[PDB]
Amino acid sequence: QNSGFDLQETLVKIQAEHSESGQLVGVDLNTGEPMVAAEVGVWDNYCVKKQLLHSCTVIATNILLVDEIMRA
Amino acid sequence: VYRNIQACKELAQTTRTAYGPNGMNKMVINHLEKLFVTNDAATILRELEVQHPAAKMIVMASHMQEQEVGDGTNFVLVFAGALLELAEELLRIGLSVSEVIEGYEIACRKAHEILPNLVCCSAKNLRDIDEVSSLLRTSIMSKQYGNEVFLAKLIAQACVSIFPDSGHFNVDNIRVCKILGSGISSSSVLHGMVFKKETEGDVTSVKDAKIAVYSCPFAEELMNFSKGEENLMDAQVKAIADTGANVVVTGGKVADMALHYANKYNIMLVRLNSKWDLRRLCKTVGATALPRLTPPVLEEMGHCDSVYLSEVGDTQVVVFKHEKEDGAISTIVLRGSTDNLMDDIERAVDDGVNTFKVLTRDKRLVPGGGATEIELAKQITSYGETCPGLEQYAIKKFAEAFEAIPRALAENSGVKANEVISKLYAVHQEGNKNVGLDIEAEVPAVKDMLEAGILDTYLGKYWAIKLATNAAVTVLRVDQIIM
Amino acid sequence: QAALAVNISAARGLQDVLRTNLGPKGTMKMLVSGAGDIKLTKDGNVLLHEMQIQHPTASLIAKVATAQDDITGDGTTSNVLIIGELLKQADLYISEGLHPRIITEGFEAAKEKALQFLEEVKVSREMDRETLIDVARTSLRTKVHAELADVLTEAVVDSILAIKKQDEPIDLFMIEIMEMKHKSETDTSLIRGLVLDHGARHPDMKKRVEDAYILTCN
Amino acid sequence: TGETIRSQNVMAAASIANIVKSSLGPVGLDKMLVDDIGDVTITNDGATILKLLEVEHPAAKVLCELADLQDKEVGDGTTSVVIIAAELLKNADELVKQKIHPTSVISGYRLACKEAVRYINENLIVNTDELGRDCLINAAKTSMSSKIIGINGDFFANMVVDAVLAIKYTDIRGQPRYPVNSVNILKAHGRSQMESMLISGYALNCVVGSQGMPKRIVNAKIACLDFSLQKTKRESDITKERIQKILATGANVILTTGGIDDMCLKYFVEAGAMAVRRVLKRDLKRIAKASGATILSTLANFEAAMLGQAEEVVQERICDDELILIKNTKARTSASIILRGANDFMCDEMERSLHDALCVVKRVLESKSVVPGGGAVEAALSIYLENYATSMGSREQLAIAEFARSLLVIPNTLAVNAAQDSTDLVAKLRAFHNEAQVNPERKNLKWIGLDLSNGKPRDNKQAGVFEPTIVKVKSLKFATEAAITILRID
Amino acid sequence: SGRKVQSGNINAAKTIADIIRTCLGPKSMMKMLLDPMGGIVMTNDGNAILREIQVQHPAAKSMIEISRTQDEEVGDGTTSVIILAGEMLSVAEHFLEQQMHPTVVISAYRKALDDMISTLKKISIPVDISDSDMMLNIINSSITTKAISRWSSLACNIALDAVKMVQFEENGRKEIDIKKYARVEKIPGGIIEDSCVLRGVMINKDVTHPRMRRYIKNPRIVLLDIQQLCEDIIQLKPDVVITEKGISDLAQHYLMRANITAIRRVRKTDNNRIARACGARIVSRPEELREDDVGTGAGLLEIKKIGDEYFTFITDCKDPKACTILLRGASKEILSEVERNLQDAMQVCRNVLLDPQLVPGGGASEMAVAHALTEKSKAMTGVEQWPYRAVAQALEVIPRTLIQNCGASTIRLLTSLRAKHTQENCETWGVNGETGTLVDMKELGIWEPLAVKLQTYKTAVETAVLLLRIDDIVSGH
Ligand SMILES: Nc1ncnc2c1ncn2[C@@H]1O[C@H](COP(=O)(O)OP(=O)(O)O)[C@@H](O)[C@H]1O
Numbered sequence A: 001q002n003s004g005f006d007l008q009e010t011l012v013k014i015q016a017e018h019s020e021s022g023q024l025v026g027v028d029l030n031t032g033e034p035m036v037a038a039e040v041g042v043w044d045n046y047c048v049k050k051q052l053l054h055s056c057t058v059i060a061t062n063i064l065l066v067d068e069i070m071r072a
Numbered sequence B: 001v002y003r004n005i006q007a008c009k010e011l012a013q014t015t016r017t018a019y020g021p022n023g024m025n026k027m028v029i030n031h032l033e034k035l036f037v038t039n040d041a042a043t044i045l046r047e048l049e050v051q052h053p054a055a056k057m058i059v060m061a062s063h064m065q066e067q068e069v070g071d072g073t074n075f076v077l078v079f080a081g082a083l084l085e086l087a088e089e090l091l092r093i094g095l096s097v098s099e100v101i102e103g104y105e106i107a108c109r110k111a112h113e114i115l116p117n118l119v120c121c122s123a124k125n126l127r128d129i130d131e132v133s134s135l136l137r138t139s140i141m142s143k144q145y146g147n148e149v150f151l152a153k154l155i156a157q158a159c160v161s162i163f164p165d166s167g168h169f170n171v172d173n174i175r176v177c178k179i180l181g182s183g184i185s186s187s188s189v190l191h192g193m194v195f196k197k198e199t200e201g202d203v204t205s206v207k208d209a210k211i212a213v214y215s216c217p218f219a220e221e222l223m224n225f226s227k228g229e230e231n232l233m234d235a236q237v238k239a240i241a242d243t244g245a246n247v248v249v250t251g252g253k254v255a256d257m258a259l260h261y262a263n264k265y266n267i268m269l270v271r272l273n274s275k276w277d278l279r280r281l282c283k284t285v286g287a288t289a290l291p292r293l294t295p296p297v298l299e300e301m302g303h304c305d306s307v308y309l310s311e312v313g314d315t316q317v318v319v320f321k322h323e324k325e326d327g328a329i330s331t332i333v334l335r336g337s338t339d340n341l342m343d344d345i346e347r348a349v350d351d352g353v354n355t356f357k358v359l360t361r362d363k364r365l366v367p368g369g370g371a372t373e374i375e376l377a378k379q380i381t382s383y384g385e386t387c388p389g390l391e392q393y394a395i396k397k398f399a400e401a402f403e404a405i406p407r408a409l410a411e412n413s414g415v416k417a418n419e420v421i422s423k424l425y426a427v428h429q430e431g432n433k434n435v436g437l438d439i440e441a442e443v444p445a446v447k448d449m450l451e452a453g454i455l456d457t458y459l460g461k462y463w464a465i466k467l468a469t470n471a472a473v474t475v476l477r478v479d480q481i482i483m
Numbered sequence C: 001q002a003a004l005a006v007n008i009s010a011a012r013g014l015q016d017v018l019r020t021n022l023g024p025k026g027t028m029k030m031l032v033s034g035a036g037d038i039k040l041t042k043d044g045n046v047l048l049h050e051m052q053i054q055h056p057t058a059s060l061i062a063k064v065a066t067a068q069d070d071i072t073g074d075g076t077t078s079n080v081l082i083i084g085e086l087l088k089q090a091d092l093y094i095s096e097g098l099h100p101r102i103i104t105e106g107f108e109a110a111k112e113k114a115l116q117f118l119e120e121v122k123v124s125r126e127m128d129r130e131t132l133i134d135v136a137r138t139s140l141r142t143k144v145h146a147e148l149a150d151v152l153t154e155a156v157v158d159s160i161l162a163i164k165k166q167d168e169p170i171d172l173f174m175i176e177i178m179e180m181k182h183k184s185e186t187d188t189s190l191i192r193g194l195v196l197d198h199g200a201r202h203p204d205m206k207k208r209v210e211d212a213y214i215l216t217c218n
Numbered sequence D: 001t002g003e004t005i006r007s008q009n010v011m012a013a014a015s016i017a018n019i020v021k022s023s024l025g026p027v028g029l030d031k032m033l034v035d036d037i038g039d040v041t042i043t044n045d046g047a048t049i050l051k052l053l054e055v056e057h058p059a060a061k062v063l064c065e066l067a068d069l070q071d072k073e074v075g076d077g078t079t080s081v082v083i084i085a086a087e088l089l090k091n092a093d094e095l096v097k098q099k100i101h102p103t104s105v106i107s108g109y110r111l112a113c114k115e116a117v118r119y120i121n122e123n124l125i126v127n128t129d130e131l132g133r134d135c136l137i138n139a140a141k142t143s144m145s146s147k148i149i150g151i152n153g154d155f156f157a158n159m160v161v162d163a164v165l166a167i168k169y170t171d172i173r174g175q176p177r178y179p180v181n182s183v184n185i186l187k188a189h190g191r192s193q194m195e196s197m198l199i200s201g202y203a204l205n206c207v208v209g210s211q212g213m214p215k216r217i218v219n220a221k222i223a224c225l226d227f228s229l230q231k232t233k234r235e236s237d238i239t240k241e242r243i244q245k246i247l248a249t250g251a252n253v254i255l256t257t258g259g260i261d262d263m264c265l266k267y268f269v270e271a272g273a274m275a276v277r278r279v280l281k282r283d284l285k286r287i288a289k290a291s292g293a294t295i296l297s298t299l300a301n302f303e304a305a306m307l308g309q310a311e312e313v314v315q316e317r318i319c320d321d322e323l324i325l326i327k328n329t330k331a332r333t334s335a336s337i338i339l340r341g342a343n344d345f346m347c348d349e350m351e352r353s354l355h356d357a358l359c360v361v362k363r364v365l366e367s368k369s370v371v372p373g374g375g376a377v378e379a380a381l382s383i384y385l386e387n388y389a390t391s392m393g394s395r396e397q398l399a400i401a402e403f404a405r406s407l408l409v410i411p412n413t414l415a416v417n418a419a420q421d422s423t424d425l426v427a428k429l430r431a432f433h434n435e436a437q438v439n440p441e442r443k444n445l446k447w448i449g450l451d452l453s454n455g456k457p458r459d460n461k462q463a464g465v466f467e468p469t470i471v472k473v474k475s476l477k478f479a480t481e482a483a484i485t486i487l488r489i490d
Numbered sequence E: 001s002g003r004k005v006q007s008g009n010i011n012a013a014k015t016i017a018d019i020i021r022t023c024l025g026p027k028s029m030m031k032m033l034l035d036p037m038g039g040i041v042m043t044n045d046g047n048a049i050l051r052e053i054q055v056q057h058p059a060a061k062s063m064i065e066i067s068r069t070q071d072e073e074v075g076d077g078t079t080s081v082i083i084l085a086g087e088m089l090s091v092a093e094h095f096l097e098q099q100m101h102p103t104v105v106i107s108a109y110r111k112a113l114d115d116m117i118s119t120l121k122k123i124s125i126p127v128d129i130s131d132s133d134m135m136l137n138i139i140n141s142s143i144t145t146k147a148i149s150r151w152s153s154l155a156c157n158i159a160l161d162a163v164k165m166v167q168f169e170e171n172g173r174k175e176i177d178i179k180k181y182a183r184v185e186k187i188p189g190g191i192i193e194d195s196c197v198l199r200g201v202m203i204n205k206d207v208t209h210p211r212m213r214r215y216i217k218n219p220r221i222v223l224l225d226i227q228q229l230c231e232d233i234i235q236l237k238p239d240v241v242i243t244e245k246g247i248s249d250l251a252q253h254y255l256m257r258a259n260i261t262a263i264r265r266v267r268k269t270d271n272n273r274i275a276r277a278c279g280a281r282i283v284s285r286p287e288e289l290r291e292d293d294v295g296t297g298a299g300l301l302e303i304k305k306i307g308d309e310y311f312t313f314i315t316d317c318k319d320p321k322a323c324t325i326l327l328r329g330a331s332k333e334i335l336s337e338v339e340r341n342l343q344d345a346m347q348v349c350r351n352v353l354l355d356p357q358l359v360p361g362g363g364a365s366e367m368a369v370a371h372a373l374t375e376k377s378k379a380m381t382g383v384e385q386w387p388y389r390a391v392a393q394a395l396e397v398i399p400r401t402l403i404q405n406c407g408a409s410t411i412r413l414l415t416s417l418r419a420k421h422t423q424e425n426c427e428t429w430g431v432n433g434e435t436g437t438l439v440d441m442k443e444l445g446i447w448e449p450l451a452v453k454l455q456t457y458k459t460a461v462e463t464a465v466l467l468l469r470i471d472d473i474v475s476g477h
């Protein structure tokens, strides 16, 4: 969406490519096309992703478990 | 994003009509509710306190443009406004902000690398005072109307040519002294810095004179108090006259006792000094202020070489000349009915000074008067269709934004903009770069001004184009904020 | 842009109204008229033909649905539920672009695949009394009480297996439903030939006719 | 509320003018007119505009009937008279608003009208004589301008003006007269429009009644008839007795509007006749009046002398078409124009241009007293009247001065409707006419007006942009009368 | 007043132009109409929605009437004209605001249309006449994608005979044609394949009592509107006379004495087609009687009752300009489409006789002509060139709406189409209307009649100049 291309179409192409190929295909933000994302040097950090996986879940379940907001 | 575009468009439209020599005047009411008439875009915009943050961005970009070019702010406003208003309909088509950003960047790079291909430059050098004065008519025609340019160019250039030492030129030394009186034709040029005093006990031929700038300017018991006041005043004046002080400057008043004490040591009583003088004196003759009258010390004391009163303009004014650089400071003496039209004259003088300084940094000149604008527009819009991809629309829009400026100049001249722009664009294919718009004729006729000598600068135009493009790109990127 | 949202809301409202009718265990609604007389029913066809719908396009949906599925037996409420769910699912993708033509192509491809699947899943067990019992029970327990349906299944299945001898499905005239108002609703059977509504003023004329000749001729 | 009712009447008149102002001129814009039932109405000329306009205010209504009665006299300039009247009304109302009593206004307006109408008679043109050739051609081409057909346009102008001058009548009054329906268009095939030449008389494309016609017969008595010579089963079969009797009377070329006879070829070569079908009634009357004859309801019961005659008949094939050249009859009314091309449909532009050239040439041929067009007359009166007022002396100085200034509203409207800048063009016209009287050497500069085709100053006496003197005189008189009538109301 | 009136007209124009801009193409969206009573109708046709919608602005009413009258003139393209006019007015927005008079705009538009005609006549690929293969290709291009997908053969054969039974060699070589003299018989009953073509008109009416002769080897049909005329007909003794008066039994025997077979209760809708098929002349005035009273009619007649109703069979006419196209089937829900398709096919045959060409479809022709004008504008000068480029740019509206009502992004597809099209010299690449992908039209087999394209462009330009010529609308409310 930010790159300007069609939202669902790009993901459809990416998933179609990744289905057949074990390579972690990525998105190229200049043509809206699937890309290997390894040789292009688009690497992102790892510890950030690992911490994000916990930090999203904790807040998600906390907000989802709330009930009956009160005017304290 | 459309609100930001609307705000920038309105701001550009406010000052668009002031473009060129045919700018409408403006009724300027300052914060303190004072009448003011002018046509300069920078003066009104610096007075315009706009509220939309996009307007803030575009105005501060214009301010940065004025910082190192000294003029063309009206041009950058018109150009950026055109760029944004075209980007408005390009966004309305359904395009993305990013892709028009890359298109604009490519167009800007193309314009920068095609600009130096219009070589109508300075003839031989900053010398030949008459020739360069004829060259400096551009900004003079720009701010002040063409009626007075013949004298304004000579007054502005004769002063800046006084000190062409080693190819280094500076602006701060160039100052203008306010002298009301007879008509504009009576204005002239002088060397040094001019301001007036009060007393007549003045000595002309003075050697190195130490300038004393003041930070703070000017029945038995009754007789005792009067005698004490007399003793205190005598002590103050003898403290002033210490270390062989010969000249003293002050923004205060005069007194019979004060002038008697001043003439006791044969010292002139420079009084009614301008409020702007206290630190310009320090920066021009290495002076400093005194907390009171008792502590003038030689270490914290000024030094001027020539201190004599000049009767030029039928007014008593003291001028400082033959300084350490022996030619650095060079004032301009003015004459007019009132300060209202004086302001435009001195602003035109400043614009001429800045354009001459740009010439010092660049002896390369380009044709003006809508010539280079339409030339660059033609080159870019011809290159546009040769570039496949989505940046092509941004390229044509950048070209149209270039097209906007001559249209604004035309409609300010009072002629039909569409007809003259069509004629000029059509002729530019074979009636090449040197062609352009003609001001005098009421019919929309074109005229080649290579002979006319009205040629705007190169480096200033380059920086103006670059900075206006960057401003439009930056303001296009922001999406929204709650307001 | 927003007309689609309006149609979606109307279809979802119609679906939600018709949710609690599908299945034999589903509850039943009741219809009230301006006169005061009320009708108690659960079948979708009569519900859509009798409901007073507010939203216009919801009325469109009801009218077109009844018109099309009058041809087949029933499945009206199931059809309405499926179309409402289709619209909702399509909306969850439309809300982020996804021009409706692509969703239409996906729908048509899924329809083709489902048609082939149904073709290859259908079970062609040979007809007998037991299968007709089962079909009658399944089609009757979704419109009336449990034991009433169980009683009526035998009558309807016997009538239908009687009809089946022609080797061609015919209906309307050949099966007639008579209506009367005896207190014992448990009495429900089938009568061959014809049953006439009433007779004339005759004191014990023939009664047990046995063999008879029919000429009528008004 | 309500004050200075004359101001409200003047505002109503100004509104009526502004409704019609932009529509003046051939390049004027169209208007949309809507009634209660929503009918459509598209037009340029203001006569029908005021005919169908729904006016409500009484003072505006007065201008409406003044324009209407202007229409019934000359049928042109109603827009000009309305605009002139509105400008005079607003100027006079202003003059009242600086406290000049309206009686002096009315006296000055009457005096200025008399002075201007006297000035017209002393500065008109009578060049529409036999010696006016190039002016007629270029006027016809200006009427035909903005057309590609102008490559051979000069030849078309020459032939059309020659045909219209040859076909000219000589009535009882003596003034030249021309029948518009006498000449008509006629398509042709083969060679293109560059070879479309003149036809000396009316020619009908039909079957060859008699090819053995002499090139120039001694006498060709045209006998137009409606009864067909067809065999049936004073005669039972009208085939022989009628034609024999009409030939014995003296008629030579007997024309039957209906079909031909089977054996009529033998009869028509020994009697100099021919049966030509598809004769247009609008053209049958024209040829009857050209020969001098009349249509016969029936031949039964005149024909010896009532039936007209011609001095030659040509039967030849021209541009792949055989034509019945019944030309040079007793009265020169029989004429036609050949249109070379492919069909009538794509030649609509050239036939329309020929029609407009015919109309303008017929308008300028009559009313020999003529005036220059393109606003030249208005500039000339504006030069005359200002000086005349300044030399008049009495209290009516400002009345005549504002009259002179108001006579220059028509050039402004023409310049606006031509997309050119109004002020520049009117200033150029006035400056050009300045030396037309200030310097007697520039005496021929009086005929300087607007060139509507481009919007430039140019002589129109040479250009032929012409208007009848009577039309403009009555226009000015009607405008002045309307102005007086309105200003005399309070 | 001033610019505001023109702005109002052209805004009202743009609104009804873009109200249905999505409704064309093979993937047209379906519009939603509701009257203020709850009645609901779902519509996919531009003419129907424009008819049912109610608007009050005179400009909108005028353009709706323009579309309606263009509908009968050519048939197809009834919405492309509205879209083109609206887009041209929307681009003229920007020139009306910068204070240029409408006159120069009209001049530029007329020059642009003059270039339009020549450019269309240039790029149009030629097509022959009556050859089966590309004729059926045309049928697939235009007639299909509708409810006659499984019954295209009947429409094909009906069109093939129709384009040959209305030939008019009046003033040239068969270039004249009509669509109203075809004796079409839309009678429900039987399978749809029962339709057939019969040479010569046929009449739904016949003699009440068939105790009499109708068919003669030389039918000399005579049109006519007291026995005086009956025994004055003996002037030539035509075998059959068609009139509009009742005949009694004694009157029928009087006809037999007169060697004529008159008819009764027959409308003009049959009489005019009878006259066209037989080529006779009507005369009743005693003085008008001559040798030209009777013109020979058809060449044969037949008595036959089809579908338990009495018909008159005028077969093997002298002039095959008014023949019969019989049509039998279930109902009329399929045959109105057949009627419009045969009208389109007759127009195609007529224009192929006029200009045997087929411009590429799918916006390929639009791209070609836009490229031609945008390259020609570079040479010519004058301030008038801005509208000249604007009309060409706004003519791109057809491909953009085609891509829009397909799912694909218009901007990228349009840029790819144009950028490819400029470098291409004579390719005429277009866009697939079903998948929204670039494809050469000669490969995809889609083409458009030349006459309808010329009519659409000329009508759009004329409507633009008409709506920009108007300077005021005030004549009351
Ligand atoms: N005599 C002239 N004829 C045509 N254009 C002129 C003339 N003098 C100056 N100009 C134009 O005016 C422009 C600058 O004017 P203006 O915007 O008022 O001030 P600034 O120099 O601050 O931009 C220059 O680009 C120049 O081309």
Ligand SMILES: Nc1ncnc2c1ncn2[C@@H]1O[C@H](COP(=O)(O)OP(=O)(O)O)[C@@H](O)[C@H]1O
Pocket (backbone or CB within 6 Å): D023, D024, D025, D026, D044, D045, D046, D047, D075, D076, D077, D078, D079, D080, D142, D373, D374, D375, D414, D450, D451, D452, D453, D465, D467
């Ligand atoms: N080609 C032309 N060039 C300049 N002026 C013209 C031209 N044709 C006509 N006119 C002017 O138009 C005036 C008549 O216009 P108008 O009043 O609109 O006609 P009408 O009265 O029939 O509506 C004339 O006075 C004439 O001067």
Ligand SMILES: Nc1ncnc2c1ncn2[C@@H]1O[C@H](COP(=O)(O)OP(=O)(O)O)[C@@H](O)[C@H]1O
Pocket (backbone or CB within 6 Å): E023, E024, E025, E026, E075, E076, E077, E078, E079, E080, E360, E361, E362, E363, E431, E432, E433, E434, E446, E448
């Ligand atoms: N299958 C298709 N593929 C590509 N283009 C098509 C297709 N069908 C129609 N078109 C285009 O759509 C345009 C409009 O035709 P259509 O929508 O059928 O009728 P109308 O013009 O009356 O709306 C035509 O010019 C044609 O080129």
